[PDB]
Amino acid sequence: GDWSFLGRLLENAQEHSTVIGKVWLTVLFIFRILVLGAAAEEVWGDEQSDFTCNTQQPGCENVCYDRAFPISHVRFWVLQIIFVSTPTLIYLGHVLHLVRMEEKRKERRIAGALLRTYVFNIIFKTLFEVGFIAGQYFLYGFQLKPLYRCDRWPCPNTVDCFISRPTEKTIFILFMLAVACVSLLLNVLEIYHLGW
Amino acid sequence: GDWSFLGRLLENAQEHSTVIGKVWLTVLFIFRILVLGAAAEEVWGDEQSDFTCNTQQPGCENVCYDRAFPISHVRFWVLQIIFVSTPTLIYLGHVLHLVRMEEKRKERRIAGALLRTYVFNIIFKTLFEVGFIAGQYFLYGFQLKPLYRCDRWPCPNTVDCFISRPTEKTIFILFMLAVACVSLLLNVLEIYHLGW
Amino acid sequence: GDWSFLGRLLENAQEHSTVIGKVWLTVLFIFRILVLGAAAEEVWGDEQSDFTCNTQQPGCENVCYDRAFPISHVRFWVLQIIFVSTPTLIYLGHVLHLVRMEEKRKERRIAGALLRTYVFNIIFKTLFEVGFIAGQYFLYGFQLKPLYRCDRWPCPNTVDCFISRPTEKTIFILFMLAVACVSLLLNVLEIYHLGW
Amino acid sequence: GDWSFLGRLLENAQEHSTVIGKVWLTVLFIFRILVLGAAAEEVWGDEQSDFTCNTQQPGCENVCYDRAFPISHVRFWVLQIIFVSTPTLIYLGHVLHLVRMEEKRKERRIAGALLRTYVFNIIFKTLFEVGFIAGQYFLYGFQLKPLYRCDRWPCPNTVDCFISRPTEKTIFILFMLAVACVSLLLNVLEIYHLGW
Amino acid sequence: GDWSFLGRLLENAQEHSTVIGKVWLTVLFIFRILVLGAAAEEVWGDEQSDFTCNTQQPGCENVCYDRAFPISHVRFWVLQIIFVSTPTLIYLGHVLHLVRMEEKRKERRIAGALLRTYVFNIIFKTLFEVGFIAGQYFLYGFQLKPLYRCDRWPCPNTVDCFISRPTEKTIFILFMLAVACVSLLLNVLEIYHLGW
Amino acid sequence: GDWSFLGRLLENAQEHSTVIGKVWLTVLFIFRILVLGAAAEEVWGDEQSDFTCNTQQPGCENVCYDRAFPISHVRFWVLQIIFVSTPTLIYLGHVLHLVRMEEKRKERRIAGALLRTYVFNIIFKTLFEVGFIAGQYFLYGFQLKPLYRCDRWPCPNTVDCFISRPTEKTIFILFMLAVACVSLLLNVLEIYHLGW
């Protein structure tokens, strides 16, 4: 995963953002992207190769892994990172557009319409963070149990399947939840600093 | 996959493009290339190694995987990215050619022929996006089912084969479809902003 | 693991830090991050693939590895690196904030509030280093024995499981402990140089 | 595969090349190098690991894969890329040599000998492209069939072996052929634009 | 293994070092780091996966590999590189400290204390090189034999285990020994050039 | 394998080298380093994993691979590249030393001693290229046969072992031989251009 281009754009957003916004971006880079690439990806590397079911039925392990893990937590976190970054890019684009328009007018910061877009950016960021949190909760909860009981065809009756690294995965699930909640708190602080 | 050179050329196109065009390029970088490299490639990594068939026939799994997946979705998306980028490079080359010709004439933006080429770029982009969408539909549909029934020689009679990660793959198929459709909408908006 | 962004921010902190602080950062880069990426990650690469249990029970090896290693040492060290870096980033952010405020005031180092934040940075760094050391001790100790005895369900009775590379892992555990203790000594020297 | 150095030299050639030459280089970068690294290498990754023969004879699969695939298509394409790039480097070296000689003479573009070398570059490029095309044809054709029949010792009698991903490989074979033919057309256009 | 940061610091040391010191650094980069990353790491890649023991005893191969190879040669060489680099960083830090102090004094090379630190750097470098050489000798010798006889529990009686690539590993062991001895000679030449 | 640092130093040598020397360096970068990293490394990737022997004897495959391949061709080529580069670095160091001495004298190209060192560089380059060629010949010849007959203990009597990819490996052996011989011819041309 090469996050270079998103990083380069979000550092530009850092130049035009509030101090709390700069904190939020630093959290995104260090506590989400960096952890994901240095720690979590490895943890989940053997998610299917080390997933085992007590059965001689061909195809059962495939369908049972798929049912247990419709989307890997790491993929979900990648999507979450991209969506919570997107409004920042929208605001930065509006910034660059107004700067280029100003340069043109000359040939021939946060107030006004730019402040309205900034605050909308903070709102959409908040809603997307909340949505991904709640989706993670309703899909997986905040804990991975070692045992998964599977009755999906072709599996005969109910089969016992065993997860790879349930405890380490639970640790990182809770870590990422905490980081997301810190991000929400930062957004709320941005909207209370702007309000005040 | 190293997209550095294409990125460097498309950022140049960003300098000479319309605001909606800049949005389109940002979508290309963040929602297609970045997702492909950070999420999808991994999902499809074990497409054949985890593909299983209920048979003792040597060679059956090979032919059945090949019939089920004549071209992996990720390869198709790579090709799609390159073709929908190509017209942008054509327009940028015409731009650079006219700039160098202007420098020469001095030694010894979007209107005129450059606007005609820009609009042709938007047209070919649209047609290629549509073509890849329709091709994906007629080849795979927009869903991967866990079970694939295969009767290709040497397989005896009909054999049951099981896909790796059908649900995660379906999620990303639909995600990439949505991103492609957003790109089409952006192209249409470019041609309506230029028209108006 | 791409530590580029954290490195780029901590080199900025190096520009605004004390000489002992510069030593601390150099230790972080060379004796923790570099070792982790060049040596330790490889050592732990086959932590589960080479973990073996004397049993025919499906799922036992999974649960036994998970119980023996709730979180891999390398993941723990990654987290430790990030948390002991975080206060440095806080102090650097306060620095940049005051510099930007000074530039603004002009339009329209370690003393004062900046020295208070610096010393708080050294305090939190110390507490986090100590906390990770003590956590490592209470979780794993400072030695990995080849034999792990496991009675976790589904394992029948008690099962003998064997670790991958116990001795090399012990060497690197003790190396990382020594590096952490050197870091603590450096922090103490920072607070005694500032006191004097 | 790190193509950085060749890229850096060919972009210099881009600075001193004709517009059609610039198109040719862009095709080389985007439709050959980028595809090879982002798509094809992966397709061929399991060329031998997923190659299967219906036999209990030790060593047969090795010799049969070797006979079927004396050189992998991807290696052949790497060589082709390097050889069709080489004349460009020769011309660029002559350019730099004349520029340095001019600087020396001062201390103490395409006409003349430089145009003769340019046209020889286009000729050798054409001949090498044609040679690699014809070699690919006589070695493999333009299609990979799933079944390979092998009678090489130690294989007893004739053995049935099955290819990995024959259809995807055929798609990329034909794609690379088309790209090579487009390159030939571009060379011919360079020599007709220079002639006219 | 990403040696970028250590390289960047040691090139700074190159700017402030003696000609023989520059030779030493070049040897470090080309004959130790580059070889380690381009050749040796691969040789040792399958050190445990290809290590085989003639036994049906679960866990024996694990304990026997661990006893034969308490620390892989490549990890040892990484540590050696870092420790023999460390004094160079100390000297460079003293250099930068004196330069910054000089700039401060202005606001408000090798002689003196800087020469004393340089010579201490050469001394510690020598002692660390010697220590790693002697440690390698007492741990492994300068040759890896194909056969390792193991009686460690759970192995029943004495078991015959076979090493991966003993001869290639011996070649690289002797190569790295020779490079270390060349480094020692260079240090001795530095101290004799400084003495004279 | 990261050749960045050697490349950066050899491009400096390119700035101070003869035109034929520049050709030699370009050959080194494009036809040796680039091929090695983009093509050959992959070919040899499964050298031991796909090496098979017709035996039930534990340890025989290990010893037989080791006897057949005491050092992999790719490792040998890496060493060859480094040694044939080394004299270039020596000459470049002498160049930089004289330039720094000139700057010092001012404070307080190829003729003279610099030409003597240049010609010695060409001589050592030639001798090392010849030595590696002859060593490759006496060790492996210029062809890898599929069958290797092995009688090394523990193998009972004589065992038949089969090589991975003998034909592709032979192709690349002959390619690298041809490239080395071209390099020798270039050296001879350097010494005849200097002589004349």
Residue numbers in the entry:
A (entry chain F), B (entry chain A), C (entry chain E), D (entry chain B), E (entry chain D), F (entry chain C): 2 to 109, 137 to 224
What does the paper say about this structure?
These intercellular channels establish a ~1.4 nm pore that couples the cytoplasms of neighboring cells and enable direct passage of electrical and small-molecule signals (such as ions, second messengers, hormones, and metabolites)3 and therapeutic agents. Intercellular channels are constructed by a dodecameric (12-mer) assembly, with six subunits assembled into “hemi-channels” that dock together through extracellular domains, resulting in a continuous ~1.4 nm pore for intercellular permeation.
Structure determination by high-resolution single-particle CryoEM resulted in a high-quality 3D reconstruction, with an overall resolution of 1.90 Å (gold-standard Fourier-shell correlation (FSC)). The quality of the CryoEM map allowed for a detailed stereochemical structural refinement of both Cx46 and Cx50. A bouquet of 15 ordered lipid acyl chains is held in place by each of the 12 connexin subunits, which appear to buttress the channel assembly by filling a cavity formed at the lateral subunit interfaces (blue). In addition to stabilized lipids, 396 ordered water molecules are resolved throughout the channel (33 waters per subunit). Nevertheless, these stabilized rings of water are nominally positioned at the acyl-head group boundary of the extracellular lipid leaflet. These waters are stabilized by hydrogen bonds with EC1/2 residues (D67, R183/Q171, and T207/T195 in Cx50/Cx46) and expected to be further coordinated through nonspecific interactions with the phospho-glycerol backbone of the extracellular PC lipids (and discussed below). A cluster of four waters are buried within the EC1/2 domains coordinated by residues D47, E48, Y66, F70 (π bonding), S73, S204/S192, and K209/K197 in Cx50/46.
